[PDB]
Design an enzyme around this catalytic site. Sequence first.
Site, PDB file in Angstrom:
ATOM      1  N   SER A  95       0.869  -1.169   0.000  1.00  0.00           N
ATOM      2  CA  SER A  95       0.000   0.000   0.000  1.00  0.00           C
ATOM      3  C   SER A  95       0.917   1.233   0.000  1.00  0.00           C
ATOM      4  O   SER A  95       2.122   1.111   0.266  1.00  0.00           O
ATOM      5  CB  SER A  95      -0.902  -0.016   1.245  1.00  0.00           C
ATOM      6  OG  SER A  95      -0.160   0.190   2.439  1.00  0.00           O
ATOM      7  N   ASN A 150      -3.616   6.298   3.705  1.00  0.00           N
ATOM      8  CA  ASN A 150      -3.344   4.991   3.110  1.00  0.00           C
ATOM      9  C   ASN A 150      -4.302   4.486   2.015  1.00  0.00           C
ATOM     10  O   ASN A 150      -5.528   4.513   2.166  1.00  0.00           O
ATOM     11  CB  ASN A 150      -3.200   3.958   4.232  1.00  0.00           C
ATOM     12  CG  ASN A 150      -2.590   2.661   3.757  1.00  0.00           C
ATOM     13  OD1 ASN A 150      -3.308   1.712   3.463  1.00  0.00           O
ATOM     14  ND2 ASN A 150      -1.263   2.607   3.693  1.00  0.00           N
TER      15      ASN A 150
END
Length: 130
Positions: free
Chosen positions: A51, A60
């Site tokens: 990520s 995120n």
Amino acid sequence: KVFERCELARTLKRLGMDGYRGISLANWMCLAKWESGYNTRATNYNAGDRSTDYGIFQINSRYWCNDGKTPGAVNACHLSCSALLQDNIADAVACAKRVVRDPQGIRAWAAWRNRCQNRDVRQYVQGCGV
């Protein structure tokens, strides 16, 4: 864009971040400082789970924005992660508000617990006129 401290403080207040979901402006400033150093174009790839963290609040891609390459990810803020790299922080702020609407609140960012929680955060907004 790299914001100067008080410039950012005034912007966040105008965007309605002071006291949002019980979070003082000084806490938001502390978060931005340790996450990106007030830099809107900062990105951080997390090799461990594939990520990436985007923007001034280092949001995120697994849960909050879509970048297409993150496995099993969702887009709770309903935004392209690209929107979080603009100089105008309106979209990043709207998404940060969405993040704290979850039960964890500001605790969602590990950096806040380590560098801001239970500290005198007044320094981040002193003299800014907010």
